[PDB]
Design a protein around this ligand. Sequence first.
Ligand SMILES: *[C@@H]1O[C@H](CO)[C@@H](O[C@@H]2O[C@H](CO)[C@@H](O[C@H]3O[C@H](CO[C@H]4O[C@H](CO)[C@@H](O)[C@H](O)[C@@H]4O)[C@@H](O)[C@H](O)[C@@H]3O)[C@H](O)[C@H]2NC(C)=O)[C@H](O)[C@H]1NC(C)=O
Ligand SMILES: *[C@@H]1O[C@H](CO)[C@@H](O[C@@H]2O[C@H](CO)[C@@H](O[C@H]3O[C@H](CO[C@H]4O[C@H](CO)[C@@H](O)[C@H](O)[C@@H]4O)[C@@H](O)[C@H](O)[C@@H]3O)[C@H](O)[C@H]2NC(C)=O)[C@H](O)[C@H]1NC(C)=O
Ligand SMILES: *[C@@H]1O[C@H](CO)[C@@H](O[C@@H]2O[C@H](CO)[C@@H](O)[C@H](O)[C@H]2NC(C)=O)[C@H](O)[C@H]1NC(C)=O
Ligand SMILES: *[C@@H]1O[C@H](CO)[C@@H](O[C@@H]2O[C@H](CO)[C@@H](O)[C@H](O)[C@H]2NC(C)=O)[C@H](O)[C@H]1NC(C)=O
Ligand SMILES: CCCCC/C=C\C/C=C\C/C=C\C/C=C\CCCC(=O)O
Ligand SMILES: CCCCC/C=C\C/C=C\C/C=C\C/C=C\CCCC(=O)O
Ligand SMILES: CCCCCCCCO[C@@H]1O[C@H](CO)[C@@H](O)[C@H](O)[C@H]1O
Ligand SMILES: CCCCCCCCO[C@@H]1O[C@H](CO)[C@@H](O)[C@H](O)[C@H]1O
Ligand SMILES: CCCCCCCCO[C@@H]1O[C@H](CO)[C@@H](O)[C@H](O)[C@H]1O
Ligand SMILES: CCCCCCCCO[C@@H]1O[C@H](CO)[C@@H](O)[C@H](O)[C@H]1O
Ligand SMILES: CCCCCCCCO[C@@H]1O[C@H](CO)[C@@H](O)[C@H](O)[C@H]1O
Ligand SMILES: *[C@@H]1O[C@H](CO)[C@@H](O)[C@H](O)[C@H]1NC(C)=O
Ligand SMILES: *[C@@H]1O[C@H](CO)[C@@H](O)[C@H](O)[C@H]1NC(C)=O
Lengths: 552, 552, 9
Amino acid sequence: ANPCCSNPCQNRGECMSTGFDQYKCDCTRTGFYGENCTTPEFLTRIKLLLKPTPNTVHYILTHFKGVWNIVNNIPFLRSLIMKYVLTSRSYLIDSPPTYNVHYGYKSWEAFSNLSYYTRALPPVADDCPTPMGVKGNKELPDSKEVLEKVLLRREFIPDPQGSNMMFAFFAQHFTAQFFKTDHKRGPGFTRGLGHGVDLNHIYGETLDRQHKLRLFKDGKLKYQVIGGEVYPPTVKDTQVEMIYPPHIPENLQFAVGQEVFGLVPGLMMYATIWLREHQRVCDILKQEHPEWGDEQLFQTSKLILIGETIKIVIEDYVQHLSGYHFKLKFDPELLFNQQFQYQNRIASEFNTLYHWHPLLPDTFNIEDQEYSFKQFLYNNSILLEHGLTQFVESFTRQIAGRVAGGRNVPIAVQAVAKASIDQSREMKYQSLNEYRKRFSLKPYTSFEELTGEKEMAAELKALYSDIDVMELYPALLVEKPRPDAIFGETMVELGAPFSLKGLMGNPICSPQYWKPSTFGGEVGFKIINTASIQSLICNNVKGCPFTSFNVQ
Amino acid sequence: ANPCCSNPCQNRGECMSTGFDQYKCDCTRTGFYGENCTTPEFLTRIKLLLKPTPNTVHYILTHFKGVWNIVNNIPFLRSLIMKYVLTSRSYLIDSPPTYNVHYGYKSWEAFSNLSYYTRALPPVADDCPTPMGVKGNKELPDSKEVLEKVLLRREFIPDPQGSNMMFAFFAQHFTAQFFKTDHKRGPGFTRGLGHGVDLNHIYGETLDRQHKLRLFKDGKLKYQVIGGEVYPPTVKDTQVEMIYPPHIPENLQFAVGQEVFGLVPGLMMYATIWLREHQRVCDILKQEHPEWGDEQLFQTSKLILIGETIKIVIEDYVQHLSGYHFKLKFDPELLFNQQFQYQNRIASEFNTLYHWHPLLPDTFNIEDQEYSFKQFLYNNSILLEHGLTQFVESFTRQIAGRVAGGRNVPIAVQAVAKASIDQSREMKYQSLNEYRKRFSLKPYTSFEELTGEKEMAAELKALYSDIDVMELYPALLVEKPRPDAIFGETMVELGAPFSLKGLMGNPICSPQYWKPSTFGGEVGFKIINTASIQSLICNNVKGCPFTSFNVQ
Amino acid sequence: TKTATINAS
Ligand SMILES: *[C@@H]1O[C@H](CO)[C@@H](O[C@@H]2O[C@H](CO)[C@@H](O[C@H]3O[C@H](CO[C@H]4O[C@H](CO)[C@@H](O)[C@H](O)[C@@H]4O)[C@@H](O)[C@H](O)[C@@H]3O)[C@H](O)[C@H]2NC(C)=O)[C@H](O)[C@H]1NC(C)=O
Ligand SMILES: *[C@@H]1O[C@H](CO)[C@@H](O[C@@H]2O[C@H](CO)[C@@H](O[C@H]3O[C@H](CO[C@H]4O[C@H](CO)[C@@H](O)[C@H](O)[C@@H]4O)[C@@H](O)[C@H](O)[C@@H]3O)[C@H](O)[C@H]2NC(C)=O)[C@H](O)[C@H]1NC(C)=O
Ligand SMILES: *[C@@H]1O[C@H](CO)[C@@H](O[C@@H]2O[C@H](CO)[C@@H](O)[C@H](O)[C@H]2NC(C)=O)[C@H](O)[C@H]1NC(C)=O
Ligand SMILES: *[C@@H]1O[C@H](CO)[C@@H](O[C@@H]2O[C@H](CO)[C@@H](O)[C@H](O)[C@H]2NC(C)=O)[C@H](O)[C@H]1NC(C)=O
Ligand SMILES: CCCCC/C=C\C/C=C\C/C=C\C/C=C\CCCC(=O)O
Ligand SMILES: CCCCC/C=C\C/C=C\C/C=C\C/C=C\CCCC(=O)O
Ligand SMILES: CCCCCCCCO[C@@H]1O[C@H](CO)[C@@H](O)[C@H](O)[C@H]1O
Ligand SMILES: CCCCCCCCO[C@@H]1O[C@H](CO)[C@@H](O)[C@H](O)[C@H]1O
Ligand SMILES: CCCCCCCCO[C@@H]1O[C@H](CO)[C@@H](O)[C@H](O)[C@H]1O
Ligand SMILES: CCCCCCCCO[C@@H]1O[C@H](CO)[C@@H](O)[C@H](O)[C@H]1O
Ligand SMILES: CCCCCCCCO[C@@H]1O[C@H](CO)[C@@H](O)[C@H](O)[C@H]1O
Ligand SMILES: *[C@@H]1O[C@H](CO)[C@@H](O)[C@H](O)[C@H]1NC(C)=O
Ligand SMILES: *[C@@H]1O[C@H](CO)[C@@H](O)[C@H](O)[C@H]1NC(C)=O
């Protein structure tokens, strides 16, 4: 009944009810006007005519490799370009944050309560006739039906971009610090009150946990040495709570920042690598500052790893994902003369779009074995059995599945894919097209346009009837990928802005923090600025195995 | 022993130890260079030569009343000017925040832990020889001595600017929402995790509290009606944890957002006024939105009062304090084209400088009665006895004491003044001169220069010996005021930047929030934009008594 | 001002 159920206001104008059956759009700063903020102002008309589409830009960035080569080698140019890509995203995210699962309108509760994931688009009011507002039927199509018909994997579809298991597990380990859904409260709530890259998955969310994981000597983290190799301490030794099935021996219950990392040996591998890297940095700083104590050694090391993490995520992780010939760059200075807010609140939608399960292979090949999902889950003995070196060489070789494309979600993890659907509905998410508009993308006019084919499109049409009622999550996994890419337009355009805010919005990226002294000097600062996924492994994995996020 | 104990690095350059007995200054972005960041860069020099001193600017702003008149009436000009005053402060506060009582160097703990007040200047390292670093004696002069010799009041010194009791109590009530020291933890800790104007002193810090204070009808706050007058509800009815001395009559045990106002009749008066104003706004919004429910009515009203509060604090409160002929203006738009961070963390120093106790009179005169501190604290009956109207008329008439000047702290509150001294020392505050430099002010070269006289200066010289060891808090209460002003240079220059961040840094001041729809439309938006201390009282105090922050 | 004037009347 809410007069705003149809999402009448366009171009980001805000809808407000003005009576039981009337609404008004607040077109403030939208660059448009009119009942629905649809009439463009002059300069808007101009700007629109001069803005190239995301696909045109993506094309340019993935071609002319030759010129990109000269550019990549002209610091001034490279910086210039990176600045464009940075600021081009900027105007997209609301920061300070606005809505959440419970507030379809700004409120001090929505703003102040850090326990909620924020929302890029407000929820669909509970009193709306249909789930998407007023379009579609009283009910959305059965999620099991959507799942099976177009999401489930028949034959493994490898990622054309070459993503491997090093990448798949890094994605999982990395995002685990900020996507920590508070199940006891609901899908729209989080336990990561830091709302970003704070590395709590290494150090713990609370001072209490952190203290239990620290050695309190040289600023280091506790650790055990098994077979001459450095591993995390155990739950018995530290008493930090971890999530482990009853039959897991004590000697195999490792204590790490994130209590869920024992669920996969692939996660415990990164946990061990970063724990190692912390100590490494501690040793380096101790050498430079024989006068420092444990606290400063610890704190400064944490600041450096935060920086290393951001560096790697942009120059290695995102670089890979992008497929650009242009070398992405981590340089906080690029934003210093720009209007930018050094703060971030993790969006529910960022969490949703990030359910990249089709990445998972059907089996995990380490050295000579192939492990099923079952014998891999909760088995840290496989890691101790093969060792980090073998794990790295193996994960570097194994290719990951394509995400966009359709039907590539491993059946072994189908309940997770169904939950994404079900939960998005719970949190009353708006349609795929509403989110596309929300991010300056052209809405799809047909399911065939979305998938770029006929079979799945037809099955979708059968289930949804109207493209304007199509859901975001399923759409992301079925969307026509880009030329030999892992993702389609919607995934890149919604995720990029969320990522930039989570990466560049970190305090260490701000002017007062971005200086050598913050990281113990030029030495510590260099660790950040020369960090790469290869160095991280090289420095912390016996033998320094070659590695990357793509399968050679 | 810390090589940085002498605060060697100037112009905001950062000091870092490079060995047991060596340091290095990080002059990044300081505009200077050299071992101590004292050699200016050409442009720096240029700039320095063109920046007028705070006193020159203060002079201009307090003279030429005639031209200020034309300006005050040329919207474009007025905006233009207000923009200058706004941006002129800007570059002063670290935001994202940096240090705190426990961290003299940036750390993730200092950044993330919202339980700490942030620090404008890092603490003096625990291993330094003297309290101020390396200057002065192993000990600072007895605080009782300083207190008595130059802080205690002999004869009431009235504020030349005319501040009254309406102003004194508004200062207390207002700042009580963000200066909520966590005594069980220490002076450098706070319970106001909102770190700003969130109006938790009306609505409560927590949801549980807020809920106990709400009526859950029309978005209103619970209240009782005594003798036809609306007052906050009781503890028995709301069950809001709050425990009054056992003898307080049941109906006199008011339940309000801040559990400490219940004592003071003057604080309870503002509590009653704002409670009344909330309901008022609720009624107004209900009229505009007969279709809205309790939650939105409540939430939207809270957003409006936050705006009203900021409006009044800038255009009425600060306006008064300033003494400017120029009409200060609350306009978030003025910052939209500026680089500004919409976030704030309350500084320990802002709390310290705000200990404006000399404002308190020796007795409180309400109507014909004159009350001592003893019978005017913990006694709510006085308020019910006289009523809000009489309280307003009386508080508007009674003048407040001058703050700067020296010897004007009521003996009745001397322990509070001693604590400020003692606690500042506890939190290892740096000297007055270090803070003056920190805020681009010229350090004082003599105690006579500081006080602008000889008697107190001489007593101070006797106690401290060196001006460079003089403490910030005492200095603020003894500083030579400005021409017929309540404060001296240091107070205005340190407080202004902290205030602007706390006021303009509020989310509702950001572009995404600063629009009519956020406050329920043009009507609600107007409430914010036409708000004044006279309207607040007029609309909520029977009879609409005249009022202002100055004694006619 | 305006409010004070009419309300005080
Ligand atoms: C961020 O938003 C979250 C979602 O709203 C907040 O969590 C939710 O918080 C509420 C309030 O704390 C909680 O419900 C509570 O109220 C119930 C009823 O109140 C009564 O119980 C007391 C008991 O002493 C009694 O004296 C009164 O007469 C009255 O009966 C309680 O039954 C319930 O246990 C709880 O205290 C929601 O369950 C909660 N849900 C979460 C668990 O998902 C969250 O608090 C907020 N964060 C912040 C920092 O504000
Ligand atoms: C912001 O900073 C504040 C100042 O550092 C933090 O408060 C301080 O937090 C620490 C840690 O929680 C607290 O000390 C704690 O540790 C003591 C010892 O650890 C032990 O006790 C456990 C009990 O289960 C035992 O299993 C272990 O073997 C070991 O003996 C405890 O005795 C103490 O009770 C406490 O838990 C400080 O007292 C604390 N002080 C505050 C109260 O002023 C604050 O936590 C932080 N905020 C955030 C959000 O991180
Ligand atoms: C602004 O948007 C509203 C809501 O979408 C439009 O209203 C619809 O108008 C058509 C044609 O009159 C009707 O068939 C619909 O029933 C109307 N209501 C809804 C909820 O769709 C309106 O036409 C638009 N106004 C302008 C000036 O473009
Ligand atoms: C930079 O600052 C340091 C520290 O204040 C200066 O060192 C002092 O120099 C004088 C003269 O040599 C000595 O009397 C002091 O004992 C030195 N140490 C301290 C702690 O004061 C240094 O001279 C400055 N350097 C420059 C280039 O100006
Ligand atoms: C600072 C760089 C910001 C990125 C802007 C440039 C290019 C975007 C290109 C590709 C990224 C692909 C998909 C987006 C989805 C999730 C974000 C992943 C990174 C993170 O989890 O954060
Ligand atoms: C938008 C505000 C701009 C302020 C800059 C302009 C003028 C400053 C002049 C006088 C203020 C006097 C003292 C400063 C100390 C504390 C702040 C009080 C207001 C508050 O508790 O915040
Ligand atoms: C001078 C630089 C000119 C760049 C022109 C780029 C045109 C890219 O055009 C793009 O081609 C893609 C096919 O790969 C399509 O899928 C996209 O929809 C289309 O916009
Ligand atoms: C080899 C993979 C074939 C995938 C096609 C699945 C078509 C829908 O088949 C479904 O498969 C699920 C997973 O096995 C089962 O749990 C369901 O009961 C079944 O109906
Ligand atoms: C192939 C590996 C893909 C990892 C991407 C994980 C993206 C989201 O991550 C998951 O989101 C869920 C919310 O529904 C949370 O409950 C989970 O704890 C969280 O890990
Ligand atoms: C039109 C521009 C006139 C500029 C002249 C500014 C003079 C301000 O001069 C100020 O006068 C004060 C006395 O009131 C002194 O205390 C200050 O130190 C001094 O700088
Ligand atoms: C005349 C009224 C003057 C009001 C100014 C109060 C300034 C400081 O405010 C006080 O600071 C204390 C910490 O030292 C806190 O414990 C108190 O709760 C807080 O109100
Ligand atoms: C656990 O890992 C070991 C070592 O690789 C493997 O042999 C075994 O099958 C696994 N155990 C279970 C219950 O899956
Ligand atoms: C409390 O207030 C009343 C009313 O003004 C006054 O007469 C009385 O003396 C006060 N009581 C105490 C115990 O101070």
